[PDB]
Amino acid sequence: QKIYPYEMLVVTNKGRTKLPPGVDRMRLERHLSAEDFSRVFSMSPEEFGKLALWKRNELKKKASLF
């Protein structure tokens, strides 16, 4: 239930920094709050739940959370 702002969790390979402690690299979008999540992806966590794995990963890549 870690809560963090949006573009600091955006990981850029240019910077190689700005990583928070004690977060799993695998799944970063869970820690985003619901209203920030709805800002970023324009869709609820439920219907994000039905989405396929490749489509979800493409959504991460678009939002630069991959």
Added chain:
Amino acid sequence: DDIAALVVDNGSGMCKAGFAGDDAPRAVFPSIVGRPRHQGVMVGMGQKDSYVGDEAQSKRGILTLKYPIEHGIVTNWDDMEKIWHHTFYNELRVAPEEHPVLLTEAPLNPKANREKMTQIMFETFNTPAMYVAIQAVLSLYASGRTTGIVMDSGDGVTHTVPIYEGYALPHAILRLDLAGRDLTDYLMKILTERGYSFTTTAEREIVRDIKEKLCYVALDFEQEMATAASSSSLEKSYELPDGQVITIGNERFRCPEALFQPSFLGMESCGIHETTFNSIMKCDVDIRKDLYANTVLSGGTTMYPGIADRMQKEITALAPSTMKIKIIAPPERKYSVWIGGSILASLSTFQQMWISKQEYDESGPSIVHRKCF
């Protein structure tokens, strides 16, 4: 009246040189010969036919670069003569006719290479004496132990030799033609997937630098592949001399994996770990336990991170689980062969092992087969 004998290591990629009895080589420079490929329009400047060494690397943008040695065998002899002359007169500043010289070569080679080296070095450079040694024996000398198995992988050739109590076994010597040049070519072939195009020799040098800086050996290949496909932690950014920034990503560990599985390059041969195991198992049954405990790595190709753990794990998987496997990789392994030369020419008895000019005048260039292992 002690004169320091010159020790010159002429590898496939880079050439090193120094004096006997020292700790580190004085001269280290790439063995690259460059030639111009464009039109010269400024009359007034000096004309230079060939660029040798680092001077070829500094102005590589207008040159075709050629290696005089590939796969451990030299082909263009004039370029090799230019490399030797630049080593003797510009990097060490010594008279070649005063000091003896010591050279290195691969274990299995065409027979004419030693004879041509001997003929060139007594005729063109007029040296008083010389000797030709095998790089793996010098690596074992620099390791400081009498017994062990030496796996030396340079820029052009890989070879494994076993030695027990100073007695080398010639029938268990294994030579494999896998080295860093094939890894660079494979990195060229796999960097096209991301959309980056590298085609000329300057691009070859850039790709070689990329491989040197941002490559590592995976401990588990399938685990690393799944992790790299699932997320984007394994990504690094390198910017070219032009200024464009490229991202490698997955290709960091796929290129070093060609050493362990040569099926990626199309070769049917076994990996380096199975090559070492087959070289060990070809020896006698009694001396295998000592060869497990004294495995020595050498060469710059074994400079990748995580190579020792993967080698130890693979050999432990191959070997029976009663004998205890130790891998010995010194941090300064890249120069270790040359360091062996600094011991070999410093021994008291080795002064009776030189190939004198008089014996050359008796027996032609074929004395090197009788006097060198």
Added chain:
Amino acid sequence: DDIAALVVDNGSGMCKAGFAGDDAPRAVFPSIVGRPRHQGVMVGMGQKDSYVGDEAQSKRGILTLKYPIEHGIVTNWDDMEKIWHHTFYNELRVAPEEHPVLLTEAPLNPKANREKMTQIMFETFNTPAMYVAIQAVLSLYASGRTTGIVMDSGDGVTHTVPIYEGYALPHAILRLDLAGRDLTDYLMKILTERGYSFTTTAEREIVRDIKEKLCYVALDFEQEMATAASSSSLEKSYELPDGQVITIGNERFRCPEALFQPSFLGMESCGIHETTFNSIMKCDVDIRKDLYANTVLSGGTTMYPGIADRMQKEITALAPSTMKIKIIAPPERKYSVWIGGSILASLSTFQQMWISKQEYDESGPSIVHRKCF
């Protein structure tokens, strides 16, 4: 019952489309997108936003011409949906959602090209099934033999690949970047010597027409230069669309000669004959004899007169003299990449290797990397 699967050949210079069982392609047209540079002045005439295909070729004066494909890689995609929509709905008059689609691509390409092609063909056009194939593999299907090495030289790239007994060797595939567009640019550069200037994109089609009409490959380059400098027998006259007459003269065999000596454009890479020979020597020993006897030419760039004899002479000079080399050049090689593709859509065993729609739905656009090739 069974429904025919239309095959679409996407090329840098020309795009072709047809049905599975047809002898010849249904429609062939250049892959050009035109946009009006000027400003419309007439009220009520109506204006068209973009010109796609042959119409854009007709109104060369008032348009700027853009190629969506450069060097075999799709640079602009909106032009590619424009071209595919014009292919499906205008040149064929067929609904694309009831037929399978077969596409061709270069051997060494970025994977994003394949994923984007699959994603556009599935999400937008609603194709039930589609497949991606290499062009020079289809060249052997058009030829009718199961063993040989293929030259495929189009307008974007020039790739050679050997296949022996139906098995392809991925490590011997070579992709030279020299193609017909570079020859067009070189013809533009060498036509400035006589005084004729061609600058705009609308004149590139005129230069291409001059190249197609009055160019040939010399058997002996220096002899032909001496003959051209001696007399004026080999001089031809071309008529421009607006009425002037130009005399090409010497340059006719100096445009495609750059295919065999790429140092004219400043490229370091070897010629096409040396590329074929190096692709041969990268294979194994036992299959080179069959590969010399089955060299197959393909692509429009190999439509110059006398290229087969020059290639045969150069390969015979390079190869050992004890065995014979024949260059197999069918008179309809320009459509061979299409024709074999049609043969790929007619076999009964090809039905279950189509990429199903629900397979794409469950596995993403990366299914092309594991289903095709």
Added chain:
Amino acid sequence: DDIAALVVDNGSGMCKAGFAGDDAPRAVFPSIVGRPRHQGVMVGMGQKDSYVGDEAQSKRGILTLKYPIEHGIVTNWDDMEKIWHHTFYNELRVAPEEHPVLLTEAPLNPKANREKMTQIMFETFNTPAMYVAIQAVLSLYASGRTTGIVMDSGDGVTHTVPIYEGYALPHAILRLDLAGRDLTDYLMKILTERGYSFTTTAEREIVRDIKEKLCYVALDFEQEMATAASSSSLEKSYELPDGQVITIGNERFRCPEALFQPSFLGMESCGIHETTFNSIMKCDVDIRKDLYANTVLSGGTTMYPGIADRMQKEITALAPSTMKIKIIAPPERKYSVWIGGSILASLSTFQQMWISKQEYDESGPSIVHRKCF
């Protein structure tokens, strides 16, 4: 729509106004403002300050005549308001505030011309909508085609403009200051040769009336000089208002040769055929084949007999022999600039391109450049 727009062409010599959708202009009258002479019998004139139109033309004996248009440029604006007031109230007898107004303008004119024209119209006539068009596009509209080169030759200026499929080429528009007024002045200068003298503006109108009825263009200048010097077959007689008869003879075809040889007037520029050829050659190399076949003549100056054959011969001499040249000379070309305007106000699309009262009200007089070409 029952509401009919007005089409007004304000030429340098004559103004032609009418209703939209008609084949012929309803009112045609010269644009001449006559002011009282400084001396003698102004008694017949009453309260009125000046005369405009045909009544100024009838009473030439007591008036000095002034043209408000100088080379297509408005120098006096009060005279233009008088001309427009006379047009709107003494010819059509319709209120300007109920009907939209369409106006014409030469291509290369100052920006202040359109802004001042729109400002005067909107301020002093309260028209709900108005538009400014270019003359030669209207001529091409009246011709019925959307591709060709238009040469307009009015009473103040000559201009050539090409159009390809409705896209005008602003970089190929050519403007030459050679028209009927300079020809009238040259005819006056060469009529001194016989003995007749004209200086007064009324005598300017007399010379213009002579030119409009007796001049023609020679096919061959030297041949016509020889046949005029050989015999008196070409002489014709004109009757002056004062009752005596003059004979022109030789110089009836010497007046229009200033159109093809402007060195007679002393100016530097070239003839109309050279101007048309240079306007054609300034276009792209691809569209010229259309522009040679669709040459369109216009203007009142081009009504001399034999102009079409002479111009066709000159352009055929200039152009390459392969091309086919055809000159389109309609018999109604004198009103063509009006006629196409009657077409342009009739189209349904043009109803969306009027300049409304509100748009002028917020945007000032600068809306013309943004809304019109």
Added chain:
Amino acid sequence: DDIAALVVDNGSGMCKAGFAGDDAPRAVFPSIVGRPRHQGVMVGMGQKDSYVGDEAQSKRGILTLKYPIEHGIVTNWDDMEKIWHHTFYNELRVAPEEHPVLLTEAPLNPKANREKMTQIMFETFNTPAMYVAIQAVLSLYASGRTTGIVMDSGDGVTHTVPIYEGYALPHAILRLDLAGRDLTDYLMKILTERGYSFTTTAEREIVRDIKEKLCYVALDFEQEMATAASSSSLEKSYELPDGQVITIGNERFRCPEALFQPSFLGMESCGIHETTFNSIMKCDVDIRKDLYANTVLSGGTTMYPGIADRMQKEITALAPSTMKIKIIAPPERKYSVWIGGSILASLSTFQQMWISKQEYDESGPSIVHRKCF
């Protein structure tokens, strides 16, 4: 010492001649030949067939002025002989039969121009030696640096060449036909829009003087247009030779902007900054870094105030942000193409590169391609 050679720069706008070794040319005069237009009524006044050079500027009223050079190519050779005779015998008073001659030529042009120039100076002038060199190579001699990219812009030709360490790249040489005369014609076409009319060849010199005195390059275009529209602080007054006063204003910076946006003239080609960037990116990857920091401006056309800042801003926008851009603009760059030539004839190693009279006698006019670049 040896005889100092004559450096002659045949620029399209001006011809500049001087002895080698000096820091400034001794004779600078426009390359204009004028011929009489009207007739000479006076008897005994003396007759002159043509006025060459500066005297043609003295009497512009009664002449037709022609340039023997247009777009860097010689169109009339009798005028060139007159120009060269006036240069040698009048402006310098030197015997050309005892002096070598250095000439300056555009990079890409018709090839027969060099042969004709060689024939002219070995037949008519009987010079003992002659050499021909490219403009930008002499410019980069005058800059003082061996490595850099040179952009030159005169009255007929703009061209960019890269040179790295004295080695030129022929495939990266770029040529554009947008130059000073096109800017003068555009200035005439845009000054027509304010009501001022310039038509004759004499007024082209006045328009060129107006451009040289009252034109500058805006750092930001649309901001400058908004500033010029909002206030009247950018207006400037110019005095005509006959006493009239005109106002330029907004047209001060629109004429040079056509150098950066060639769509104003109707050209399709890119600007000078895009041309320089494209010429840089055509080079190899390693030599680009030294080329981005050594950009050299040359030629008269780049004398506009504020062109260096605009060029630096555009190139920095196109270039990657990691690297820095240096624009080298000497304050005396207009004669730079001459000054480096004065360097080239002063080198001791250049004397072996002269084309001898005997060499020309042996090989005819075709020798100049073998000796010169």
Added chain:
Amino acid sequence: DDIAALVVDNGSGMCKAGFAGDDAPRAVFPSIVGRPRHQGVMVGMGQKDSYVGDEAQSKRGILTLKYPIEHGIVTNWDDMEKIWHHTFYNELRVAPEEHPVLLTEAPLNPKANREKMTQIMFETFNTPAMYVAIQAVLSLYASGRTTGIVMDSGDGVTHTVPIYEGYALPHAILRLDLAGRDLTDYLMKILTERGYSFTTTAEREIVRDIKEKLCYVALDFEQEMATAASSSSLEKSYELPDGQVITIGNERFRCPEALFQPSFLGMESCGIHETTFNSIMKCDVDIRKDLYANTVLSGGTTMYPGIADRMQKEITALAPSTMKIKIIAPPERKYSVWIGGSILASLSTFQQMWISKQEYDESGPSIVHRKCF
């Protein structure tokens, strides 16, 4: 007795098969199993899991070849089953259920091999009867005499047995693991000195072909080296399958004599002649005369030229001089192990010694130890 028993001799190198009572075998083919190693991209080409026999050697380019038998021991059994199926059904077209079979193996072999051979022959192929014999005994049968010593040298093992009047002495049976495969490996090792490199399995087959074609045994070794080093009188040229020509030269007599001196290969065992001498001394005293006079050779390894004279010289040097030495080498020794086996199947007595299916079901697979030898 009416039926004919099958005779199958399946050594490590070759597999031969035929019917009883025939002088020659019916099928002779190499005992290799090949698997494809490359990606196959062809639709409808057909798929073959494995290649067995001559068709495996015909396609060595795209195959990896494995020998099912190493040193006379069956390492892999599925490949051996495939070979037996191909021999029974494809090379003979016979039903295995209708005939008995006879199989050969080396004398000193693990009995698990014999038990597994018995189990495979009975359980899968359902043969009614089967016998297992010793190769050298069948060779002595083929020689035609009862008393003699047989030194058989196959491709996997070399064994010597004495027989006196049909009585076998098991304590004098000698076995060495030195055979033709070791000689092939040594030839590959010594071919590196001249520059020829052979690594993969197809290259191994090429090297074996070279060994079969150009090898001979010298009578005197050091004299042969002196002759080969003094002049080039002993050299031969071999043509590679890809057209290259190699020169074997001095190595011709170095490969085959490693049987006589195993110290070249690192093994400490004695030569074959000393093996035969020690086997003779391991027998009794009075039976040494007949063993001296009845020495025979067998196997393809004894097919080298001049081996018989050298063996006779070494034996008569080792043996006392007073006795007679015969070395009997039939010209068809290569099939002798087969031939005598057919004779063994032609006897009326021996077919009381078949291992019946009833006996196998009665006593398991271990009956072959009591029944055979």
